[PDB]
């Protein structure tokens, strides 16, 4: 399902 996206995981 909807894991958290690449962005948001950036930094």
């Amino acid at each position, epitope marked *: 399902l909807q894991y*958290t996206p690449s962005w*948001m*995981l950036v930094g």
Partner: antibody
Framework: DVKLVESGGGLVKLGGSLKLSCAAS????????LSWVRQTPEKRLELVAT????????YHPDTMKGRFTISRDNAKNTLYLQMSSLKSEDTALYYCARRDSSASLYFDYWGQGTTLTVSS | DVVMTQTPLSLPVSLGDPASISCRSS???????????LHWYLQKPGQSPKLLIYKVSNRFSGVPDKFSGSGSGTDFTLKISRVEAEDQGVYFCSQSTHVPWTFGGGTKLEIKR
């Protein structure tokens, strides 16, 4: 210190609209992601919206979608949240919130939050 | 999205005792990157939540060692070794593996009598 300050709450008629601000002092705004979270009068859960830095990317669950819209002014250390067709189920305490930079996906700094009541 | 179910909803205690709050997501929490984004927050009567533990079991800067967290995938546990008066409020587990992020109903530490 790191201090976010929510403001602009109050009473609004149903289907009304209102703009919450969140002012962010004591750090490099342009660096962090922020969100708005909220707490149901029965004291719950509540993610509303999230935005990147120099905000070209945003997320809104599907529910909030249409009623809520996040934005920022890195050029001004302020995040916002334009609300638009308020249902009464939107009444709640609105928190401003900072994401940890290590990307561990958790909020390290919350504000005191503004109250919002939707009633005619 | 995933239903964070905490247990019990209420917890009566005498200071000095110790406690365990469960939290159980619906889907699993291992993210497609090995990270398990389960956290724990405390809310004190009248304040903003404050993060205690992140990534299942990482203490946040300034969180006393009485606190500790553990678990895997769907099931998780918050443990407190000796409860202080300071430790009383509502505790919540959020997850971030799945968007949108969700938080549990919260769990209340309250005085036993």
């Amino acid at each position: 210190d790191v201090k976010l300050v929510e403001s602009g709450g109050g009473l609004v008629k149903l289907g009304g609209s209102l703009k919450l601000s969140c002012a962010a002092s004591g750090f490099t705004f342009s660096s962090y992601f922020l969100s708005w979270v909220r707490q149901t009068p029965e004291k719950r859960l509540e993610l509303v919206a999230t935005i990147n830095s120099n905000g070209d990317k945003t997320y809104h669950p599907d529910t909030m979608k249409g009623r809520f819209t996040i934005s920022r002014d890195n050029a001004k250390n302020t995040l916002y949240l334009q609300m638009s067709s308020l249902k009464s189920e939107d009444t709640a305490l609105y928190y401003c919130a900072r994401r940890d930079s290590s990307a561990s996906l958790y909020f390290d700094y919350w504000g005191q939050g503004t109250t919002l009541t939707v009633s005619s | 999205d995933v239903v964070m179910t905490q247990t019990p909803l209420s917890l009566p205690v005498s200071l000095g005792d110790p406690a365990s709050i469960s939290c159980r997501s619906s889907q699993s929490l291992v993210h497609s990157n090995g990270n398990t984004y389960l956290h724990w927050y405390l809310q004190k009567p009248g304040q903003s939540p404050k993060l205690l533990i992140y990534k299942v079991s990482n203490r946040f800067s300034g969180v006393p060692d009485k606190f500790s967290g553990s678990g895997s995938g769907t099931d998780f546990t918050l443990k407190i070794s000796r409860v202080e008066a300071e430790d009383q409020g509502v505790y919540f587990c959020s997850q971030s593996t799945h968007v949108p992020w969700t938080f549990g109903g919260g769990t209340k530490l309250e005085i036993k009598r």
